[PDB]
Each structure stands twice: as C-alpha cells, then as structure tokens.
Design an enzyme around this catalytic site. Structure first.
Site, mmCIF file in Angstrom:
data_model
loop_
_atom_site.group_PDB
_atom_site.id
_atom_site.type_symbol
_atom_site.label_atom_id
_atom_site.label_comp_id
_atom_site.label_asym_id
_atom_site.label_seq_id
_atom_site.Cartn_x
_atom_site.Cartn_y
_atom_site.Cartn_z
ATOM 1 N N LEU A 44 -4.157 -0.009 -6.506
ATOM 2 C CA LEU A 44 -3.397 0.536 -5.405
ATOM 3 C C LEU A 44 -3.968 1.872 -4.960
ATOM 4 O O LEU A 44 -4.126 2.104 -3.779
ATOM 5 C CB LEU A 44 -1.913 0.674 -5.756
ATOM 6 C CG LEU A 44 -1.146 -0.598 -6.102
ATOM 7 C CD1 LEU A 44 0.324 -0.270 -6.368
ATOM 8 C CD2 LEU A 44 -1.262 -1.597 -4.970
ATOM 9 N N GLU A 45 -4.264 2.761 -5.899
ATOM 10 C CA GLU A 45 -4.738 4.084 -5.529
ATOM 11 C C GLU A 45 -6.158 4.022 -4.941
ATOM 12 O O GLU A 45 -6.497 4.765 -4.016
ATOM 13 C CB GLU A 45 -4.642 5.027 -6.724
ATOM 14 C CG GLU A 45 -3.241 5.158 -7.319
ATOM 15 C CD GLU A 45 -2.233 5.647 -6.320
ATOM 16 O OE1 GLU A 45 -2.360 6.803 -5.890
ATOM 17 O OE2 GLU A 45 -1.326 4.872 -5.931
#
Ligand SMILES: CO[C@H]1O[C@H](CO)[C@H](O)[C@H](O)[C@H]1O
Ligand SMILES: CO[C@H]1O[C@H](CO)[C@H](O)[C@H](O)[C@H]1O
Lengths: 41, 264, 206
Positions: free
Chosen positions: C115-116
């Site tokens: 996600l990051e």
C-alpha cells in the site's frame, strides 16, 4: 490484482504496483497530474 | 488545516540557486529587485495573496513598459493599475503576468546583484524559478528503467545509465531552483540537450551551465523528466536499450524508457 | 463499491486475499484461500462486516490498522523491521496460517510493501531494489516521514490550488541522509514526482 512471489522480480513487482495505482486512482479527477482516489469501484 | 489558503509568505529562488531580493531593502515605489545570496532577511520574504499579487516589504511586485521599462519593480499597490501587479506561477517554474502573455521573469546574468527583468519567454534556465522556502538544491540519484542510475561519464563530459552503486560520486546530481540538473562534484556543469542527434532526436550530454533553454528540466507526475512548455519533450533511453549508451530528448509517450525516479 | 481485493501468493503457493477500503486506502480485512475464517481489524468500517467475507466466520483482531497500533502490538517500530522479498514471503505465510504471534509484524511488512509503495514512487523504488539485489533493507526517516504525512500532503496539494501551488502548512520530510527538508509548496520534485495517489479531502480543481 495478484502478486505471486515465485515468478517475481523487480519488473513484475512494479507492474503489480502499477496496476494497483491504475485501478484505485481516478481517471478524471487529477491535480497537477496526481490522481485522487476513486470514490467507488 | 483547511482547503483554502488566503495568503502565504515564502522565498523565490532560481538562477544558480540565488534568491529574489529587493535591492538594499529600499521601499520607494519604483525600487529594483536583484538576485542575491539566500538568507533570512525580510527583503527576501515574498507574500502571495488571493489578489494574484506578490508582495515584499508591504509593496507589490510590478511591471510596466512605460513606467519602469522592462525592469521589474515593487510599487505601491493602490498607486498603479491592477493589470501590472498580477502574477501567475506555473508547474514548470515560469513566473509571468497573465496580461503580458509573451514575457516572463528573467535574470540575464548569473551574477550576484543582477537586475531582474521581463524578457521574451524562451523557457530558459534564466527564466526558471522555485517558489518555496527551501532554497537549497535537491541532491539525489536519478533512476531509470531496469533500476539503473544516470552516471556522469568520461571525466564529467558524457552521461548514460550504469548499475547503481551507493555513494558513487558520478551518480549524484543536484537539482537547482532554475530547473538545471547539475553534476554534484562540479556545479558549473549542466545536463544539456545537444544539436547532435540519434535516430533524428537530440542527445543529452553534460556542458557548461550557460542559462539557456536546453539545460532546463521539470520532473512531472507522469514520471517524465521533461522540458517546460506546451511543445513538451521527455528524457528517453534510446530504443529501451541501456547498452546503446544514448539518452535522447523524445516525443512524450510515458513508456518505461521515459519513466524515472528521483532517489533522494 | 468501496472495497478493493488484492491477492498475494507465497513461494509455498499459499494465497491470501486482502481487502482495502478505497476511501481511506487502508487494509480492513483478509482471508486465507480455502478457509472459512476471515480476520477484520478492530477499526474496520461497519460496512466491511456486512459486505465482505460474509460466508465466513468473521474474527475481529485485537489491534487496528494504524501504524501505531500495529507497532504497539508487534512490540517494535517500522525502523526495526526488515522489508524485502523474503520478509514478504514469510509475512504471507504467517497470515495464511493465522499465526497470532506474527500477525502485527506481518501486516507491517505487507502494508508498507504494497500500500505505501503504491502511494509513493520513492517507496516503490526502494522496494524494487530489494527484489533486484535480493537483499533486505530497514526503512529510515525518509520512508517513515512519507508514510506518516501522506494524509497531510494530500490535503496540502488540494489546498494549494487556491494559492499558486503554495501549501497552507509546512510538511517536514527527511532525505536519505536524514537531513530535514521543510516543504511549503508543490514546486519540489519530492512531492510532485513522488506522490502517486492522493487521499480525497476537498472538492477543488486545476
Ligand atoms: C548588505 O546587503 C544588503 O544589500 C544587498 C544589496 O546589495 C541585499 O539587498 C541584501 O539583502 C541586503 O542585506
Ligand atoms: C520507435 O521508438 C523507439 O525508439 C525511439 C528512438 O528512435 C525512442 O527511444 C522511443 O522511446 C522508442 O519507443
């Protein structure tokens, strides 16, 4: 969107991240070219 | 925290990393603005308003061909016409007045205490500005396809992609407020697009920084390293072939050989 | 609808399905393939329980999807936890087996690497290198400061449209040498060429 570690290198990792971005980022609502997340799928 | 910003006070840096500075802290409705070493002095603070006006020392930046020539001055904000104190900042680092569409803020010399002027817009490094309070150059590696790094080769005369090696001096680049990309070990040297070609496209090399319109680059949200303007071109690994040792300036298409990452 | 599904498969061919709230871009739940169990973060939105994995026993984890909660439950911080190909493989397996000892840690790996990385080119590129050199790395303040400020950076980008690309507030980021860089406008490549997705705060436009 799927990431299989068996067949995984730098190239397929980036393709995967690329697909996550394309599916989550708005096609139309962008500011300075950076997409805002979509409200729904 | 809110979605509307009424006013802000920041710095404007550019040419060779120097700051826009109203000469000597004068406040006379007509005083001149220079490039000068960046510091914390109040005559280098610029305040942007919802007007479209840009202000230092209480007076706002202005340009009138009659009044001050093509020189750029601060005046009293109520004493002169609105059209002459409007400003627009672009993503590519161009500061201009919307009413005088062909002109752009310029610093014709790279030297301390140079007079700032309005000149025809040719998208030169002498016409590139960073609005923002961090004035220093941004140091990093530039990473292209196959996770390879841009290297300054042949005693800092040429450039192409090599395997990244942390702390290798030749792989370190300095991004200046004027939009130049400079060799970290030698700041007189700029990434530059030649007239020499490959497959009928200009080739990128390292030449002396001279403030011209082929040493000015913008990192955009599409991952490109592009020229500022409408007729835009992107840095491009020829034929998606690292081994050719050729970086060219190509029509933008957004494929992997035109995608880059700043690794700061 | 509101949830995006995403499958990860280890080198043992174990697959997990991870569900992501597109509104906050956070992980809310997952299911190991071929199981009747599913696992939901304590702060998953109510709608998640009503629409996801409804033909499973829905277990609720005793921590939430914030980094602080995850770090608290793992007993260590992001600046201590290795990322890379093999940590990810390990993480997938632990989720697949629903090993309660290794869950918080495994989420920290997966969230950052998926996600990051999607949010920031700098993180994507850091992770890509770990795949190339088949070597592990530990995130430093460069990565962590991006993760912690994404919401605020997204707000300031939107806010900047009202005043010439200037932020309403300074964001504090770090470079790879741990030098502070205070950013107060969009005219920095470490914003404009880095942020790939932004959280919605306000309806503005350029
Ligand atoms: C002693 O320097 C002073 O004058 C020069 C002009 O030469 C600059 O404007 C500077 O900001 C100011 O402090
Ligand atoms: C057919 O075009 C291909 O080669 C040219 C060089 O001629 C460019 O590198 C372009 O990006 C690439 O797709």
């Amino acid at each position: 969107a799927n990431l299989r570690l068996s067949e995984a290198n730098s190239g397929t990792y980036k393709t995967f991240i690329g697909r996550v971005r394309e599916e989550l980022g708005s096609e139309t609502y962008r500011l300075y070219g950076i997409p805002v997340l979509k409200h729904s799928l | 925290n809110e979605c509307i910003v009424e006013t802000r006070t920041t710095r404007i840096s550019g040419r060779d990393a120097l700051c826009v500075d109203v000469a000597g802290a004068l406040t006379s409705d007509g005083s001149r603005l220079i490039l000068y070493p960046c510091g914390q002095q109040v005559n280098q603070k610029w305040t942007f308003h919802s007007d479209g006006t840009v202000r230092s020392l209480g007076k706002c930046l202005a340009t009138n061909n009659s009044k001050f020539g093509n020189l750029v001055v601060i005046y009293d904000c109520s004493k002169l016409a609105a059209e002459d104190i409007s400003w627009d900042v672009s993503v590519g680092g161009t500061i201009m007045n919307p009413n005088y569409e062909d002109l752009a803020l310029t610093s014709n010399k790279a030297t301390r205490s140079t007079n700032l002027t309005m000149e025809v817009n040719t998208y030169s490094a002498s016409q590139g500005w960073r609005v923002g309070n961090y004035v220093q150059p941004i140091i990093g590696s530039i990473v292209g396809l196959d996770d390879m790094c841009l290297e300054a080769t042949d005693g800092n005369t040429n450039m192409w992609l090599e395997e990244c090696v942390p702390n290798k001096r030749e792989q370190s680049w300095a991004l200046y407020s004027d939009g130049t990309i400079r060799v970290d070990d030698n700041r007189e040297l700029c990434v530059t697009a030649s007239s020499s070609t490959y497959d009928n496209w200009k080739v990128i090399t390292i030449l002396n920084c001279d403030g011209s319109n082929n040493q000015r680059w913008v990192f955009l949200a599409d991952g490109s390293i592009s020229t500022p303007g409408n007729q835009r071109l992107a840095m491009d690994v020829a034929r998606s072939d690292v081994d050719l040792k050729k970086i060219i300036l190509h029509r933008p298409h957004g494929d992997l050989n035109q995608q880059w990452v700043l690794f700061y | 609808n509101r949830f995006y599904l995403l499958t990860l498969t280890s080198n043992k061919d174990e697959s997990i399905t991870l569900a992501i709230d597109v509104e906050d871009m956070v992980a809310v739940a997952y299911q190991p393939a071929g199981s009747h169990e599913s696992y939901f973060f304590l702060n998953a939105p109510q709608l998640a329980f009503h629409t996801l994995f409804t033909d499973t026993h829905q277990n609720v984890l005793n921590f939430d999807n914030t980094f602080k909660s995850l770090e608290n439950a793992a007993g260590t911080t992001r600046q201590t936890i290795v990322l890379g190909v093999d940590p990810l493989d390990f993480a997938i397996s632990n989720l697949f087996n629903a090993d309660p000892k290794l869950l918080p840690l495994s989420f920290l790996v997966i969230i950052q690497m998926v996600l990051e990385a999607s949010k920031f080119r700098f993180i994507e590129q850091s992770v890509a290198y770990s795949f190339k050199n088949e070597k592990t790395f530990i995130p430093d303040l460069a990565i962590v400061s991006l993760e912690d400020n994404w919401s605020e950076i997204s707000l300031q980008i939107q806010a900047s449209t009202s005043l010439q690309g200037l932020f309403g507030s300074v964001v504090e980021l770090y470079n790879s040498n741990n030098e502070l860089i205070e950013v107060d406008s969009i005219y920095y490549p470490i914003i404009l060429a880095n942020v790939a997705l932004q959280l919605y705060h306000c309806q503005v436009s350029t």
